[PDB]
Scaffold this active site. Structure first.
Site, PDB file in Angstrom:
ATOM      1  N   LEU A   1       0.786  -1.251   0.000  1.00 53.03           N
ATOM      2  CA  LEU A   1       0.000   0.000   0.000  1.00 53.03           C
ATOM      3  C   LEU A   1       0.824   1.310   0.000  1.00 53.03           C
ATOM      4  CD1 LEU A   1      -3.013  -0.755   2.351  1.00 53.03           C
ATOM      5  CD2 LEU A   1      -2.995  -0.734  -0.140  1.00 53.03           C
TER       6      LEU A   1
ATOM      7  N   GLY B   1       8.261   3.439   2.171  1.00 46.75           N
ATOM      8  CA  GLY B   1       9.133   4.572   2.441  1.00 46.75           C
ATOM      9  C   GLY B   1      10.565   4.250   2.821  1.00 46.75           C
ATOM     10  N   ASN B   2      11.318   5.334   3.008  1.00 45.87           N
ATOM     11  CA  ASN B   2      12.653   5.350   3.624  1.00 45.87           C
ATOM     12  C   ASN B   2      12.861   4.265   4.703  1.00 45.87           C
ATOM     13  OD1 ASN B   2      14.181   7.404   2.326  1.00 45.87           O
ATOM     14  ND2 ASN B   2      13.865   8.959   3.931  1.00 45.87           N
TER      15      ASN B   2
ATOM     16  N   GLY C   1      10.141   2.109   6.252  1.00 45.73           N
ATOM     17  CA  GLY C   1       8.906   1.436   6.608  1.00 45.73           C
ATOM     18  C   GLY C   1       7.949   1.236   5.458  1.00 45.73           C
TER      19      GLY C   1
ATOM     20  N   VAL D   1       3.446   0.156   4.540  1.00 44.32           N
ATOM     21  CA  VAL D   1       2.056  -0.182   4.856  1.00 44.32           C
ATOM     22  C   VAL D   1       1.629  -1.233   3.816  1.00 44.32           C
ATOM     23  CG1 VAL D   1      -0.299   0.707   5.204  1.00 44.32           C
ATOM     24  CG2 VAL D   1       1.612   2.170   5.718  1.00 44.32           C
TER      25      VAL D   1
ATOM     26  N   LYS E   1       1.248  -1.775   9.275  1.00 47.77           N
ATOM     27  CA  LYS E   1       2.383  -0.871   9.234  1.00 47.77           C
ATOM     28  C   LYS E   1       3.592  -1.525   9.878  1.00 47.77           C
ATOM     29  CE  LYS E   1       3.553   3.929  10.023  1.00 47.77           C
ATOM     30  NZ  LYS E   1       2.847   5.233  10.145  1.00 47.77           N
TER      31      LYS E   1
ATOM     32  N   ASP F   1       2.083  16.134   9.926  1.00 49.06           N
ATOM     33  CA  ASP F   1       2.139  15.606   8.547  1.00 49.06           C
ATOM     34  C   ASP F   1       0.751  15.699   7.916  1.00 49.06           C
ATOM     35  OD1 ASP F   1       3.590  14.543   6.284  1.00 49.06           O
ATOM     36  OD2 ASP F   1       3.331  12.470   6.919  1.00 49.06           O
TER      37      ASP F   1
END
Ligand SMILES: C[C@@H]1CCN(C(=O)N2CC[C@@H](S(=O)(=O)c3ccccc3)C2)C[C@@H]1N(C)c1ncnc2[nH]ccc12
Length: 277
Positions: free
Chosen positions: A15, A18-19, A21, A23, A42, A131
């Site tokens: 889903l 990232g850098n 991590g 989902v 996550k 965020d």
């Protein structure tokens, strides 16, 4: 309260990555007959861990119609996974970009108000989101959104009204860019950019990075200078003046002159009620 065997958590599709991590969409399937429920998961990829364990407790402590539901955790002896509800319609960013021809301003302001109520709530727990962007908002149905990520959320100190700490610099208050200061106020500045994104319908040529880089002519520095000389994102094509004015009040350089979220939900509800016709 829900307890998860790592073994029966089956990966369905990626889903977000990232850098540090990701989902995933997983199915929790103890009966091994694919009737298990679909959830979002996550996990961390490569103290982050301290920060991740705070995030879990933050999400857990939140229970609200416009916040994504905590479901539980999943661990290996002794690779921590945070389990949430899966919302199949996905992020508002993609959903808006998809159905722009069926989403009028009335709908826009509904989402805007449900975002303020969620943020209002966060504030009652001195939580600072850090965020706020359409990226991190989920669509539950056509008439309901939830804030869907708290990766950067902090708890304010008990005696203070700011927390000092890649960053989405085009969504950040100037005091966040220059003093790394984060507050209810900086959440409000970012909310203004969310309002901007919504009313541009995510037109790629009209995104905060594209317009700010255009007005610029170290990128960060250029941005600071621009914000300080009162340079701002323009009014979106077709945006009513009262919605743009809410944006420009959110983007006030002075933290103390920025509106409250309770005030924002209010004005936004009254502007939506005045268009109903
Ligand atoms: C829009 C949602 C929030 C954002 N998320 C995402 O892509 N991010 C949150 C974490 C970061 S990360 O994992 O890339 C990351 C991790 C660590 C450091 C840096 C980045 C990105 C996608 C989600 N999504 C599509 C979902 N779809 C359906 N149901 C859902 N329930 C819960 C999420 C979710």
């Amino acid at each position: 309260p829900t307890q998860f065997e790592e073994r029966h958590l089956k990966f369905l599709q990626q889903l977000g990555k990232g850098n540090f991590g990701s989902v995933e969409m997983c199915r929790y399937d103890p009966l091994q007959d694919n009737t298990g429920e679909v959830v979002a998961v996550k996990k961390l990829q490569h103290e982050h861990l301290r920060d991740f364990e705070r995030e879990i407790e933050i999400l857990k402590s939140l229970q609200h119609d416009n916040i994504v539901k905590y479901k539980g955790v999943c661990y290996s002896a002794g690779n921590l996974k945070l389990i949430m509800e899966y919302l199949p319609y996905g992020s508002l960013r993609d959903y808006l970009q998809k159905h722009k021809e069926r989403i009028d301003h009335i709908k826009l302001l509904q989402y805007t108000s449900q975002i303020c109520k969620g943020m209002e709530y966060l504030g009652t727990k001195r939580y600072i989101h850090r965020d706020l962007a359409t990226r991190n908002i989920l669509v539950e149905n056509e008439n309901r959104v939830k804030i869907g990520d708290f990766g950067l959320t902090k708890v304010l100190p008990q005696d203070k009204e700011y927390y000092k700490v890649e960053s989405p610099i085009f969504w950040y208050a100037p005091e966040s860019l220059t003093e790394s200061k984060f507050s209810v106020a900086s959440d409000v500045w970012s909310f203004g950019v969310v309002l901007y994104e919504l009313f541009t319908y995510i037109e790629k040529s009209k995104s905060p990075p594209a317009e700010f880089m255009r007005m610029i002519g170290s990128i960060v520095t250029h941005l600071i200078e621009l914000l300080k000389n009162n340079g701002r994102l323009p009014r979106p094509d077709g945006c009513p003046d009262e919605i743009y004015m809410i944006m420009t009040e959110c983007w006030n350089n002075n933290v103390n002159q920025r509106p409250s979220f309770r005030d924002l939900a209010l004005r936004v509800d009254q502007v939506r009620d005045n268009m109903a016709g």
